[PDB]
């Protein structure tokens, strides 16, 4: 788990998972490259004629030891000539104020040594290291918010990181948002980017309120207006914790560092109850609860609305198929999914868990291959089909628009009365 | 909104919190002057001058932008985004200088030290010393109490 | 040339030293590995080839 | 820490403080004077100590 | 439950999650209510507990009076690491704790 | 011989922010009075707020509608930013019908006179499609302070309608408070004070009326202490 | 005082005095209305002059070693010594400026007094923090050792608030990781030792 | 109702002593209990009016700090004792109080050659300790009406105008549970009067003064 001078600007220098894996796991540095063999060909400004040529020497460890590279923070003239003679240069793994002549390549970037969360550190130089690593791990341990706030103080890469995130919507091609809707967003891709068969209409169905690996929220909520012209690759829909094109994690709170009658010491959290009433840090949990109609020996696990020794009120949230209605208010212990086993029948009702009460968000009934689907599942399929037919008919509408437009243009060129053409239906 | 025991400062030696609070206060004040001109419905030229000088604040900063190039409609949209405050960038080993924070607070019309004489509301009396108070972004972990219960 | 999303927000960058090199696309390693895994390479140096 | 902090603060003394060299009969007197702000908490004053 | 820094409580006082408190003396509560005569059926006692009655809440306040119960904070290094305190119900789910403890 | 300073003037800084000065005031008594009044006004200022959400055809509150710019949860998030001075009401089911492509505003709330939308300029929603339309029933209720609706959830033991979405009520519309203790000029006695109390609200009540109600509450509390 | 209370006041009176003291300390601290300012980190005035003198000494030593007058090991030891001495002088000047504050008398005569410098306060109070931490934050991080423990004779003349040299930051990173890993390792054996003792008893 | 605020339920005034007693008030409006506590604290701190021996024309007094002969006290200590002298008077705004005493022994507050218009709270309260039999005590003290605790320097041996007739006072906010509600606050008030006023009477008086100040906004 030790750190070697060989790792100088090589890998994640502060990033380290805790626990038994302490030191067992590292991560890639920011701006160092990789040799075909898997060695750190760390980019470095080839200091050509002492001037740090734009030539980026993606340098390996032996080459690193084989070259004298000065610090990226070193002051140099406009011509790239170092201001000082004894330039602080990392030479053969030994960094020292080496002569201006001694310089071989130049360090690529200040963040090159740093990793991602490492480059995210604000004013890290004026700070210490241990709590830095702690907050670094915490940044991984951060939970998703409900409303986003750009960290007012930036290190720059936050927008870059968000771009790297990709959970948000980016422009496949450039254009203006042709049709903006809550679920389906159509962007008029410019003809320049439009391929010959391509419509030039960009559709991006945004993510919205999805359960994560931690059963956490996922919403790539829209972040643009209809018809707004944009360049290809531009961010479109505000992803979960992705806002204003920047990695949105913190909530810039005006605070003071002073104790308050023992309510604040030992890192106690002093909180304005207004924020609570404002719910400035509220959240949601979407824990998937799946019920399986297991084919059991005396008959399959009969997930059905008919449950003996049960009350009708307990069946309120469940649909006529026993399906907890989309959004149905459930209770801890309540019978969310009427299921049965043979006794005649032993009620196997997949009740919503004790202490689990709330709105029944969705019911993904995946019947076994060879097992029919309920009207609820049929309806879910119908809704998916409606959405798919909507997108498909949008594409086909653009296509038929082009076709009928060409037809009408040919008709006008052929003297067919555009007045009578317009008066007649398009068909 | 929040308050912290200043004891852990020399303990954790993480003066980055102090820098963060000071910069947050300065930038909040700058964006506050901006939003004041906005509520004042001042000249888009005047608002432009303020916003530009703010972006133009700093010396030898790698970034250089011109709001004149930004359309007047674009200037308006940019200010509208910047209504809540003035977001700034300061990369690792490229953070703002102390004098830079001082200038930002000056444009923020905020105290130079960042320590304010905020009277305690419960006490009903002025704080005995100027209290370092400022804006900073915090985070909450997936360590919900409901899980711990 | 200035991006529309970049003109939309200009954070007052305190960065003084030139950003000589562009930030690398972070997805480099995983993408490269998957590509080397997926392709049918005539060289037969890596991948199923 | 915090308790020790307040302890030192009360223990902290000032020269030329808010009303140096006064007489407080007892804890009630000084409690009034400082609680009313008539004197700084860090003021050196003679008081009848029973 | 997560330990909370109950700076208000006395050395003997303990900050007991009132919901967790309810989870605790539930049989003791049922006994109190039968002693209060209001509880005629244990199932009814469970329901009134489920009713979370103010009468139930008041009876809980009564039962809590000087009825300290064991408490422990890991790790078991010194025998002082586990101690009970006079438990006073605190509305919620946090373990408010005395300062010097 | 305690001279009771009266409500000198109310110079409305804005519709929701105003200036109130008090004078002539006893030495130091003004400071205590200001702190107390600030706390009181912030405490239980009676007010009104949208409480329950009823929109036709919405099942889960975590949902969205086609042609609606935002989601139902986001719809409530926007609805939280409402300020109005309602008259003679305690629980009103408001209406806001908007249609066609465009943003629904506070004026777009289908409104009767019983509620005076303090800032009708405020934006309600944004129907993004010409085929898109909005119409919903908004339960606006009176109250005071900031009360989470989840508390009301168990209170309404009767099953709320599927979509009878509840919203927390910060019925107290005070925005901010401040108090400048200045010296009132009254003859030669320098101890007279001109306390300048700065009040920011949501604009749903006048500074003077709020001050009077607050004084009423303060004396009502003080009844026992006087009974000492 | 608490010990004297346990002695004389015995148990219960001492406990009562303690609870009162706790409440009083919280109250007096809240009213103490003091915070910590980034400006409070007064870097030593002649810290640069001290660094320059240390550089001159190192230059003479390197000249002698290059002249052969100093052994390479002798050069390393002498450089480590010069750096440590400079760090000591820096921390000394830092604390000297810190703990003391000049004040005009009640007669207006200016006079040094125990500084209410919040850092120097918390130091003289000692409620938390180390004068070493003072040297790290506003004095000098001093000469660190190589991760092997070999005294890396380069002294980190900068201060924590003053900002970290990238080289210095990496240098300190080694010792930091060493400490973290050491704690991680030591988290184990005492449990086995105690289990053995208990099973014995 | 909406404006319906929780009026406190009279708990007790723990009559710890004649001048020191504890006041219990529960329930109390959340923080409005705390607000009222701070308010009454400030009031009693400053609004307590009363007489006060300000300028004592003691015979042969030339130095503010001096050692009295034949009396166990210093002149500065005697001035502090004169400020301490507490009494319940009626009808005079300013009174010059005469103290006729002599002989070896402690001068109590009864040793004042005083008229009947003022009732000494503790005539026993040792005015001095006249050590010598040959020692004779003669002094006039300007017992003057006032309010609060004005310093002597805020102003004939001047003495601090501690016309505030309260030795000390304290308040504590506790929490109360109302049936199922539990966020309610509880007000505990500790008062150390100067004895010349009864505790509950003083509390009623301060509340009346505050309300009278508050009338013009009612």
Write the layout of secondary structure elements.
This is part of a larger assembly, with 3 copies of chain A, 3 copies of chain D and 2 copies of chain F.
Chain A: E1 33-34, E2 40-41, E3 44-48, E4 51-56, H1 61-66, E5 68-70, E6 86-91, E7 94-99, E8 105-107, H2 110-113, H3 116-119, H4 130-140, E9 153-154, H5 157-165, E10 175-180, E11 184-189, E12 201-205, E13 221-222, E14 237-238, E15 242-243, E16 246-247, E17 251-257, E18 270-271, H6 273-278, E19 328-330, E20 341-342, E21 345-346, E22 358-360, H7 375-413, H8 418-423
Parallel strand pairs in A: 5-8
Antiparallel strand pairs in A: 1-2, 3-4, 3-8, 5-6, 6-7, 10-11, 11-12, 13-14, 15-16, 19-22, 20-21
Chain D: H1 2-11, E1 23-24, H2 27-35, E2 46-47
Parallel strand pairs in D: 1-2
Chain F: E1 6-11, E2 17-25, H1 29-44, E3 46-55, H2 72-79, E4 84-86, E5 91-99, E6 102-105, E7 115-117, E8 123-127, E9 133-144, E10 146-147, H3 149-155, E11 165-166, E12 169-170, E13 174-183, E14 193-201, H4 207-226
Antiparallel strand pairs in F: 1-2, 2-14, 3-9, 3-11, 4-7, 5-9, 6-8, 10-12, 13-14
The main β sheet of chain F shows up as: 4 strands, antiparallel
State the helical fraction of chain D. Answer: 25-40%
Q: What is the string of helix and strand elements of chain D?
A: HEHE
| Integer tally of domains of chain F | 2
Oligomeric state of the chains present here? part of a larger assembly
- Overall geometry of chain F comes to elongated
Strand order of the largest sheet of chain F: 1-2-14-13
With strands numbered from the N-terminus, the spatial order across the biggest sheet of chain D is: 1-2
> Over the alpha carbons, how many angstroms does the gyration radius of chain D reach?
11 Å
Tally of strands of chain F: 14
Secondary structure: number of strands of chain D = 2
Structural class designation of chain F: alpha+beta
Count of DSSP H/I helices of chain F: 4
**Proportion in helices of chain F:** 10-25%
Give the amount of beta strand of chain F, in percent: 35-45%
**So what's the overall shape of chain D?**
globular
Q: Which structural class do you get from the secondary structure elements of chain D?
A: mainly alpha
Largest interface: A-B, 64 and 56 residues
CATH class of the largest domain in chain F: Mainly Beta
Task: Please explain how this structure is put together.
Chain F: This is DNA-directed RNA polymerase subunit alpha. Chain F: Residues 1-228 are annotated as: Alpha N-terminal domain (alpha-NTD). Chain A has 427 residues and is of the alpha+beta class. Chain A has helices at residues 61-66, 110-113, 116-119, 130-140, 157-165, 273-278, 375-413, 418-423; strands spanning 33-34, 40-41, 44-48, 51-56, 68-70, 86-91, 94-99, 105-107, 153-154, 175-180, 184-189, 201-205, 221-222, 237-238, 242-243, 246-247, 251-257, 270-271, 328-330, 341-342, 345-346, 358-360. In chain A, the strands form 7 sheets. In chain A, strands 4-3-8-5-6-7 form a 6-stranded mixed beta sheet. The longest helix of chain D has 10 residues, at 2-11. Chain D is globular and about 30 Å long. Chain F is elongated and about 75 Å long. The chains are: A alpha+beta (427), D mainly alpha (50), F alpha+beta (228). The interface between A and B is large, with 64 and 56 residues. β2 of chain B pairs parallel with β1 of chain C.
């Amino acid at each position: 788990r030790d750190v070697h001078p060989t790792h100088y600007g090589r890998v994640c220098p502060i990033e380290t998972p805790e626990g038994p894996n302490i030191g067992l796991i590292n991560s890639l540095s920011v701006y160092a490259q990789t040799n075909e063999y898997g060695f750190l060909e760390t980019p470095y400004r080839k200091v050509t004629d002492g001037v740090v040529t734009d030539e980026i020497h993606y340098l390996s460890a032996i080459e690193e030891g084989n070259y004298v590279i000065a610090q990226a923070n070193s002051n140099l003239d406009e011509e790239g000539h170092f201001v000082e003679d004894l330039v602080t240069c990392r030479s053969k793994g030994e960094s020292s104020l080496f002569s201006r002549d001694q310089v071989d390549y130049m360090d690529v970037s200040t963040q090159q040594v740093v990793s991602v969360g490492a480059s995210l550190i604000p004013f890290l130089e004026h700070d210490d290291a241990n709590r830095a690593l702690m907050g670094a791990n915490m940044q991984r341990q951060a939970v998703p918010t409900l409303r986003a706030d750009k960290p007012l103080v930036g290190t720059g890469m936050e927008r870059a990181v968000a771009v790297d995130s990709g959970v948000t919507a980016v422009a496949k091609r450039g254009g203006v948002v042709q049709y903006v809707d809550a679920s389906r967003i159509v962007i008029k891709v410019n003809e320049d980017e439009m391929y010959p068969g391509e419509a030039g209409i960009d559709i991006y169905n945004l993510t919205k309120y999805t359960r994560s690996n931690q059963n956490t929220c996922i919403n790539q909520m829209p972040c643009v207006s209809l018809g707004e012209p944009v360049e290809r690759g531009d961010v479109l829909a505000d992803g979960p914790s992705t806002d204003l094109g920047e990695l949105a994690l913190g909530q810039n709170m005006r605070v003071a560092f002073m104790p308050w009658n023992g309510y604040n010491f030992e890192d106690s959290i002093l909180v304005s109850e207004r924020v609570v009433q404002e719910d400035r840090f509220t959240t949601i949990h979407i824990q998937e609860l799946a019920c399986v109609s297991r084919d059991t020996k005396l008959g399959p696990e009969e997930i059905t609305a008919d449950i003996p020794n049960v009350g009708e009120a307990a069946l309120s949230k469940l649909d006529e198929s026993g399906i907890v209605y989309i959004g149905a208010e459930v209770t801890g212990g309540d019978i969310l999914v009427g299921k049965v086993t043979p006794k005649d029948v032993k009620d196997s009702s997949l009740r919503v868990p004790n202490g689990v009460s709330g709105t029944v968000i969705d019911v993904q009934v995946f019947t076994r291959d060879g097992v029919e689907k309920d009207k609820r599942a049929l309806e879910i399929e119908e809704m998916q089909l409606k959405q798919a037919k909507k997108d498909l008919s949008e594409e086909l509408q653009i296509l038929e628009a082009g076709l009928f437009s060409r037809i009408r243009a040919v008709l006008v060129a052929g003297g067919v009365e555009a007045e009578k053409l317009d008066k007649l239906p398009r068909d | 909104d929040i308050v912290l025991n200043p004891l852990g400062v020399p303990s954790r030696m993480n003066i980055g919190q102090i820098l963060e609070t000071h910069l947050g206060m300065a930038a909040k004040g700058i964006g506050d002057k901006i939003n004041a001109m906005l509520k004042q419905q001042q000249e888009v030229a005047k608002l432009r001058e303020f916003i530009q000088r703010a972006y133009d604040l700093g010396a030898d900063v790698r970034q250089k932008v011109d709001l004149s190039t930004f359309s007047d409609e674009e200037v308006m949209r940019l200010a509208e985004n910047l209504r809540k405050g003035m977001p700034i960038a300061t990369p690792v080993f490229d953070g703002a200088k102390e004098a830079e924070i001082k200038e930002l607070l000056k444009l923020g019309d905020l105290p130079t030290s960042g320590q304010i004489r905020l009277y305690d509301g419960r006490t009903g009396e002025q704080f005995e010393r100027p209290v370092t108070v400022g804006y900073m972004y915090m985070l909450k972990l997936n360590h919900l109490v409901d899980d711990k219960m | 040339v200035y991006s529309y999303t970049e003109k939309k927000r200009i954070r007052k960058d305190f960065g003084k030293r030139p950003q000589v090199l562009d930030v690398p696309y972070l997805l480099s390693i995983q993408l490269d590995s998957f590509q080397k895994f997926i392709e049918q390479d005539p060289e037969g140096q890596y991948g199923l080839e | 820490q915090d308790v020790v902090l307040g302890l030192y603060y009360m223990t902290r003394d000032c020269v030329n403080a808010k009303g140096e060299g006064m007489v407080l009969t007892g804890p009630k007197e000084a409690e009034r004077l400082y609680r009313s702000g008539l004197a700084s908490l860090h003021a050196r004053v003679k008081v009848r100590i029973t | 439950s997560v330990i909370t820094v109950g700076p208000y409580l006395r050395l003997h006082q303990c900050g007991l999650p009132k919901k967790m408190a309810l989870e605790l003396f539930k049989p003791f509560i049922y006994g109190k209510l039968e002693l209060r005569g209001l509880a005629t059926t244990i199932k009814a006692a469970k329901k009134m507990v489920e009713r979370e009655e103010a009468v139930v809440w008041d009876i809980l306040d009564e039962v809590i009076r000087e009825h300290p119960v064991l408490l422990n904070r890991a790790p078991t290094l010194h025998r002082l690491g586990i101690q009970a305190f006079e438990p006073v119900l605190i509305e919620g789910k946090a373990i408010q704790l005395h300062p010097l403890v | 011989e305690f001279l009771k300073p009266r409500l000198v003037d109310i110079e409305q800084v804005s519709s929701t922010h105003a200036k109130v000065t008090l004078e002539p005031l006893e030495r130091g008594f003004g400071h205590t009075l200001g702190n107390a009044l600030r706390r009181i006004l912030l405490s239980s200022m009676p007010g009104c707020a949208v409480t329950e959400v009823e929109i036709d055809g919405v099942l889960h509150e975590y949902s969205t509608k086609e042609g609606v710019q935002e989601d139902i949860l986001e719809i409530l998030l926007n609805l939280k930013g409402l300020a109005v001075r309602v008259q003679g009401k305690d629980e009103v089911i408001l209406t806001l019908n908007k249609s066609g492509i465009g943003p629904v505003t506070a004026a777009d709330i289908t409104h009767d006179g019983d509620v005076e939308i303090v800032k009708p300029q405020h934006v309600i929603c944004h129907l993004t499609d010409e085929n898109a339309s909005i119409s919903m029933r908004i339960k606006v209720q009176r109250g005071r302070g900031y009360v989470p609706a989840s508390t009301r959830i168990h209170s309404e033991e009767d099953e709320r309608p599927i979509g009878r979405l509840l919203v927390d009520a910060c019925y107290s519309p005070v925005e901010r408070i401040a108090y400048n203790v200045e010296a009132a000029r009254v003859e030669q006695r320098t101890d007279l004070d001109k306390l300048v109390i700065e009040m920011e609200t949501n604009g749903t009540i006048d500074p003077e009326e709020a001050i009077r109600r607050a004084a009423t509450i303060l004396a009502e509390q003080l009844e026992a202490f006087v009974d000492l | 005082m608490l010990n004297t209370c346990y002695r004389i006041l015995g148990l219960k009176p001492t406990v009562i005095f303690a609870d009162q003291i706790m409440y009083t300390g919280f109250a007096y601290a809240a009213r103490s209305g003091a915070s910590v300012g980034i400006d409070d980190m007064v870097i030593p005035e002649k810290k640069h002059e001290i660094i320059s003198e240390a550089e001159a000494e190192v230059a003479e030593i390197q000249e002698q070693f290059q002249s052969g007058l100093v052994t390479a090991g002798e050069r390393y030891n002498k450089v480590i010594d010069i750096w440590a001495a400079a760090n000591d002088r820096v921390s000394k000047a830092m604390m000297d400026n810190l703990q003391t504050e000049t004040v005009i008398n009640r007669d207006g005569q200016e006079e040094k007094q125990v500084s209410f410098n919040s850092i120097y306060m918390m130091a003289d109070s000692g409620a938390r923090g180390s004068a070493a931490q003072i040297r790290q934050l506003a004095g000098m991080r001093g000469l660190m050792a190589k991760p092997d423990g070999s005294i890396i004779e380069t002294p980190i003349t900068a201060n924590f608030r003053e900002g970290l040299n990238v080289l210095q930051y990496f240098i300190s990173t080694h010792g930091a990781r060493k400490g973290l890993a050491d704690t991680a390792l030591k988290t184990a054996n005492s449990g086995y030792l105690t289990r053995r003792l208990v099973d014995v008893a």
